[PDB]
Design a protein around this motif. Structure first.
Motif, PDB file in Angstrom:
ATOM      1  N   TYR A  75     -22.817   5.730  51.968  1.00  0.00           N
ATOM      2  CA  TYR A  75     -21.502   6.352  51.854  1.00  0.00           C
ATOM      3  C   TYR A  75     -21.678   7.775  51.347  1.00  0.00           C
ATOM      4  CZ  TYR A  75     -21.093   1.326  51.355  1.00  0.00           C
ATOM      5  OH  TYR A  75     -21.250  -0.032  51.504  1.00  0.00           O
ATOM      6  N   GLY A  76     -22.741   8.413  51.822  1.00  0.00           N
ATOM      7  CA  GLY A  76     -23.069   9.776  51.460  1.00  0.00           C
ATOM      8  C   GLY A  76     -24.214  10.249  52.334  1.00  0.00           C
ATOM      9  N   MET A  77     -24.538  11.536  52.251  1.00  0.00           N
ATOM     10  CA  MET A  77     -25.595  12.105  53.079  1.00  0.00           C
ATOM     11  C   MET A  77     -26.975  11.579  52.696  1.00  0.00           C
ATOM     12  SD  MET A  77     -25.863  15.976  51.491  1.00  0.00           S
ATOM     13  CE  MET A  77     -24.355  16.587  52.220  1.00  0.00           C
ATOM     14  N   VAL A  78     -27.943  11.818  53.572  1.00  0.00           N
ATOM     15  CA  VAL A  78     -29.324  11.442  53.320  1.00  0.00           C
ATOM     16  C   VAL A  78     -30.168  12.709  53.337  1.00  0.00           C
ATOM     17  CG1 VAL A  78     -31.317  10.162  54.182  1.00  0.00           C
ATOM     18  CG2 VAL A  78     -29.030   9.163  54.324  1.00  0.00           C
ATOM     19  N   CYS A  79     -31.023  12.864  52.334  1.00  0.00           N
ATOM     20  CA  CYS A  79     -31.827  14.071  52.223  1.00  0.00           C
ATOM     21  C   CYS A  79     -33.294  13.765  51.992  1.00  0.00           C
ATOM     22  CB  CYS A  79     -31.301  14.969  51.099  1.00  0.00           C
ATOM     23  SG  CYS A  79     -29.784  15.863  51.509  1.00  0.00           S
ATOM     24  N   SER A  80     -34.152  14.629  52.516  1.00  0.00           N
ATOM     25  CA  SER A  80     -35.577  14.536  52.255  1.00  0.00           C
ATOM     26  C   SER A  80     -35.929  15.535  51.165  1.00  0.00           C
ATOM     27  CB  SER A  80     -36.380  14.824  53.522  1.00  0.00           C
ATOM     28  OG  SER A  80     -36.197  16.162  53.951  1.00  0.00           O
ATOM     29  N   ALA A  81     -36.432  15.032  50.044  1.00  0.00           N
ATOM     30  CA  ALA A  81     -36.770  15.883  48.913  1.00  0.00           C
ATOM     31  C   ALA A  81     -38.268  15.870  48.663  1.00  0.00           C
ATOM     32  CB  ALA A  81     -36.027  15.425  47.673  1.00  0.00           C
ATOM     33  N   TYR A  82     -38.724  16.730  47.760  1.00  0.00           N
ATOM     34  CA  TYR A  82     -40.125  16.723  47.356  1.00  0.00           C
ATOM     35  C   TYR A  82     -40.292  16.041  46.003  1.00  0.00           C
ATOM     36  CZ  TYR A  82     -44.868  18.246  46.253  1.00  0.00           C
ATOM     37  OH  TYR A  82     -46.201  18.280  45.912  1.00  0.00           O
ATOM     38  N   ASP A  83     -41.036  14.941  45.999  1.00  0.00           N
ATOM     39  CA  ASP A  83     -41.312  14.197  44.779  1.00  0.00           C
ATOM     40  C   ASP A  83     -42.434  14.894  44.020  1.00  0.00           C
ATOM     41  OD1 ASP A  83     -41.679  12.324  42.780  1.00  0.00           O
ATOM     42  OD2 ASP A  83     -41.701  10.601  44.138  1.00  0.00           O
ATOM     43  N   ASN A  84     -42.079  15.650  42.987  1.00  0.00           N
ATOM     44  CA  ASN A  84     -43.064  16.408  42.217  1.00  0.00           C
ATOM     45  C   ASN A  84     -44.056  15.532  41.453  1.00  0.00           C
ATOM     46  OD1 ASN A  84     -40.521  18.702  42.025  1.00  0.00           O
ATOM     47  ND2 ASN A  84     -42.583  19.408  42.569  1.00  0.00           N
ATOM     48  N   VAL A  85     -43.704  14.263  41.273  1.00  0.00           N
ATOM     49  CA  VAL A  85     -44.580  13.317  40.596  1.00  0.00           C
ATOM     50  C   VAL A  85     -45.645  12.782  41.546  1.00  0.00           C
ATOM     51  CG1 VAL A  85     -44.724  11.034  39.556  1.00  0.00           C
ATOM     52  CG2 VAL A  85     -42.919  12.625  38.850  1.00  0.00           C
ATOM     53  N   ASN A  86     -45.205  12.211  42.663  1.00  0.00           N
ATOM     54  CA  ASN A  86     -46.128  11.668  43.654  1.00  0.00           C
ATOM     55  C   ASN A  86     -46.629  12.722  44.638  1.00  0.00           C
ATOM     56  OD1 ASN A  86     -46.088   8.998  42.631  1.00  0.00           O
ATOM     57  ND2 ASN A  86     -44.180   8.570  43.739  1.00  0.00           N
ATOM     58  N   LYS A  87     -46.096  13.936  44.518  1.00  0.00           N
ATOM     59  CA  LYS A  87     -46.505  15.069  45.348  1.00  0.00           C
ATOM     60  C   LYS A  87     -46.483  14.753  46.844  1.00  0.00           C
ATOM     61  CE  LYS A  87     -48.883  17.014  41.430  1.00  0.00           C
ATOM     62  NZ  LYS A  87     -50.066  16.858  40.538  1.00  0.00           N
ATOM     63  N   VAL A  88     -45.326  14.290  47.304  1.00  0.00           N
ATOM     64  CA  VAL A  88     -45.115  13.913  48.695  1.00  0.00           C
ATOM     65  C   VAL A  88     -43.609  13.939  48.964  1.00  0.00           C
ATOM     66  CG1 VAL A  88     -44.835  11.434  48.330  1.00  0.00           C
ATOM     67  CG2 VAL A  88     -45.806  12.263  50.481  1.00  0.00           C
ATOM     68  N   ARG A  89     -43.217  14.096  50.225  1.00  0.00           N
ATOM     69  CA  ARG A  89     -41.797  14.136  50.560  1.00  0.00           C
ATOM     70  C   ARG A  89     -41.217  12.736  50.735  1.00  0.00           C
ATOM     71  NH1 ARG A  89     -39.681  19.165  51.055  1.00  0.00           N
ATOM     72  NH2 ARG A  89     -37.689  18.141  51.552  1.00  0.00           N
ATOM     73  N   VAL A  90     -40.079  12.498  50.093  1.00  0.00           N
ATOM     74  CA  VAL A  90     -39.419  11.199  50.140  1.00  0.00           C
ATOM     75  C   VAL A  90     -38.000  11.334  50.676  1.00  0.00           C
ATOM     76  CG1 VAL A  90     -40.752  10.280  48.220  1.00  0.00           C
ATOM     77  CG2 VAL A  90     -38.591  11.462  47.786  1.00  0.00           C
ATOM     78  N   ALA A  91     -37.368  10.202  50.967  1.00  0.00           N
ATOM     79  CA  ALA A  91     -35.976  10.190  51.402  1.00  0.00           C
ATOM     80  C   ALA A  91     -35.070   9.759  50.255  1.00  0.00           C
ATOM     81  CB  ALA A  91     -35.800   9.266  52.594  1.00  0.00           C
ATOM     82  N   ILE A  92     -33.886  10.357  50.176  1.00  0.00           N
ATOM     83  CA  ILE A  92     -32.928  10.021  49.125  1.00  0.00           C
ATOM     84  C   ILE A  92     -31.543   9.714  49.700  1.00  0.00           C
ATOM     85  CG2 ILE A  92     -31.776  10.794  47.027  1.00  0.00           C
ATOM     86  CD1 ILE A  92     -34.136  12.500  46.367  1.00  0.00           C
ATOM     87  N   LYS A  93     -31.002   8.553  49.341  1.00  0.00           N
ATOM     88  CA  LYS A  93     -29.686   8.126  49.811  1.00  0.00           C
ATOM     89  C   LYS A  93     -28.623   8.249  48.724  1.00  0.00           C
ATOM     90  CE  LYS A  93     -30.381   4.052  51.338  1.00  0.00           C
ATOM     91  NZ  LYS A  93     -29.904   2.644  51.449  1.00  0.00           N
ATOM     92  N   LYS A  94     -27.732   9.227  48.859  1.00  0.00           N
ATOM     93  CA  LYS A  94     -26.594   9.335  47.953  1.00  0.00           C
ATOM     94  C   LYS A  94     -25.515   8.334  48.356  1.00  0.00           C
ATOM     95  CE  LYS A  94     -23.138  12.472  46.036  1.00  0.00           C
ATOM     96  NZ  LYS A  94     -22.749  13.890  45.804  1.00  0.00           N
TER      97      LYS A  94
END
Ligand SMILES: c1cnc2[nH]ccc2n1
Length: 340
Positions: A25-44
């Protein structure tokens, strides 16, 4: 923090936001996980306004947190405000998947080999889901996230249930909906979905694309033929039976005539998965053991549930206020200072 005129607030851990679509019920974004140092997906997700929305959220979270499978999407992290009063939207962080089977079939004719290992991965994942006594209930190409030909993950467990054949008693996606659902919670309904997904990979189009559920039945019968008296009796409802009559009798279209270029072994399995009678429909372990998947099938490399799944205290008729509390409790282990 800001993406297309909308707050995301997933920092400071997740940075470099990018827009990759919306939905519910919100947009989906690909962010950079500074901890795992890899790009992840985020569901708002902003579900707290409507009771049904809270169900799907609470349902998916409880399940994805307990499941652990190579072919099932997982939840890496969950961003949320410190107090219940404060939070209006939940952020679910998952592995970034490049695309899905729905978008793939819109651009590519799949080879037989690719269809085979795709089918195997789906069934491999399903075997784990069914071993936990759980129904996905909403399997379809858009719920199959893909990275490579060897990287398939099942997603969206919002409609998931614990298998309960004696119940009785919101519906699934019409095109992949099992006939027994429309006529009268069994594991067979997922097998039927996978069948529809198989037939779609073979011809790049939905096999049973009905406009509404009655038209949906006209499509199914239009290919499987008029159901026998044995199958007709299992229909507990009246209308049907008594809407089949009025029926314009049809013959079973041979799978080879519908799918000429397709592997004969594939069609054989397809025939097993798309049987009208749910009791005669092939089971997940049997589907894997089919000669079509004989080059991948390996029971030793097909993990199952450590323990069958049961929600501690559950089910509909809980107001959206109680569900929010249960969502607040389930996401508590991703918060600082979380004891117990
Ligand atoms: C779009 C891209 N990647 C994803 N991983 C999990 C959900 C999702 N959606």
């Amino acid at each position: 923090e800001m993406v297309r005129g909308q707050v995301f607030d997933v920092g400071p851990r997740y940075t470099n936001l990018s827009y990759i679509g919306e939905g519910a019920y919100g947009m989906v974004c690909s962010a950079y996980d500074n901890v795992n140092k890899v790009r992840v997906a985020i569901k708002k997700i902003s579900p707290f306004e409507h009771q049904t929305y809270c169900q799907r959220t609470l349902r998916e979270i409880k399940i994805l947190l307990r499941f652990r499978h190579e072919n099932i999407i997982g939840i890496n992290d969950i961003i949320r405000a410190p107090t219940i009063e404060q939070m209006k939207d939940v952020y679910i962080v998952q592995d970034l998947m490049e695309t899905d089977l729905y978008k793939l079939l819109k651009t590519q004719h799949l080879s037989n080999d690719h269809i085979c290992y795709f089918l195997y991965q789906i069934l491999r994942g399903l075997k784990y889901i069914h071993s936990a006594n759980v129904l996905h209930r909403d399997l379809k190409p858009s719920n199959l996230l893909l990275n490579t030909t060897c990287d398939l993950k099942i997603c969206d467990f919002g409609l998931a249930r614990v298998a309960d054949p004696d119940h009785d008693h919101y519906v699934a996606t019409r095109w992949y909906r099992a006939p027994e659902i429309m006529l009268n919670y069994t594991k067979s309904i997922d097998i039927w979905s996978v069948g529809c997904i198989l037939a779609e990979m073979l011809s790049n189009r939905p096999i049973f694309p009905g406009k509404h559920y009655l038209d949906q039945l006209n499509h199914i019968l239009g290919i499987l033929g008029s159901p026998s008296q044995e199958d007709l009796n299992c229909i507990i409802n009246l209308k049907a039976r008594n809407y089949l009559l009025s029926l314009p009798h049809k013959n079973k279209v041979p799978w080879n005539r519908l799918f000429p270029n397709a592997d004969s072994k594939a069609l054989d399995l397809l025939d097993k998965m798309l049987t009208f009678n749910p009791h005669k429909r092939i089971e997940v372990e049997q589907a894997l053991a089919h000669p079509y998947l004989e080059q991948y099938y390996d029971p030793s490399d097909e993990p199952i549930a450590e323990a069958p799944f049961k929600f501690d205290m559950e089910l509909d008729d809980l107001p959206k206020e109680k569900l929010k509390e249960l969502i607040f409790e389930e996401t508590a282990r991703f918060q600082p200072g979380y004891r117990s």
